[PDB]
Symmetry: C2
Subunit: 122 residues, 2 copies
């Protein structure tokens, strides 16, 4: 028959590699493309890869996640540790939250960061 | 017998009013004091008046509450409304919390105050 890969333009879309066969031809697609002639832009978001209510962006051969505040990582799977810098004063114990932290103050101390000393008042 | 209220100093403590009786005397105490001669400073914190883990200060004829952050009022009974100033952008719905608020953003918006527009990206 014909070599469809040697007539002129590439019959394979999205820069796929044209491979001649007897009676037809086949396309070797680039990452992110599918179909007999690489016509389809694969939806990389179709398997729901973005966690914790993240927004999935369907791109060429990849997805990108837009994380909700307090989350990070490729799949937004990481709850950022806000306690990392040890923010609680006066031996307060730090509790990690979503884009926030909580201090558990010892008796006689109050405030978000356990700043307020109350021992002198009592 | 004797007028104990006319000998000299006041037999009633903490500026209580001395009232003579036949065979004794009695004391008419000022607010915050008790006992036959007003000797006792009443503990106004004894009935646990301070709410939401507030610190109770036992004072003369009164208590004062030291509120935990996010609480106010005489008994620290009032959870301050942080949503009062309507902080959420783009028709976000405000949820009141403890010394904090939460914005429930409509689709296409993110961030603590719903600042981030994501509609143009998709
Ligand atoms: Ca052929
Ligand atoms: Ca894609
Ligand atoms: Ca966190
Ligand atoms: Ca008498
Ligand atoms: Ca008292
Ligand atoms: Ca509140």
């Amino acid at each position: 028959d014909v070599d469809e890969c040697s007539l002129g333009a590439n019959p394979c879309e999205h820069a796929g590699k044209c491979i001649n066969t007897l009676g037809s031809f086949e396309c070797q697609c680039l990452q992110g493309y599918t179909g007999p002639r690489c016509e389809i832009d694969v939806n990389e978001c179709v398997s729901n890869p973005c966690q914790n209510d993240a927004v999935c962006l369907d791109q060429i051969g990849e997805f990108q996640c837009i994380c909700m505040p307090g989350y990070e990582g490729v799949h937004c799977e990481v709850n950022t540790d806000e306690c990392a810098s040890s923010p609680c004063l006066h031996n307060g114990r730090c509790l990690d939250k979503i884009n926030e932290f909580q201090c558990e103050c010892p008796t006689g101390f109050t405030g978000h960061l356990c700043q307020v000393d109350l021992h002198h008042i009592l």
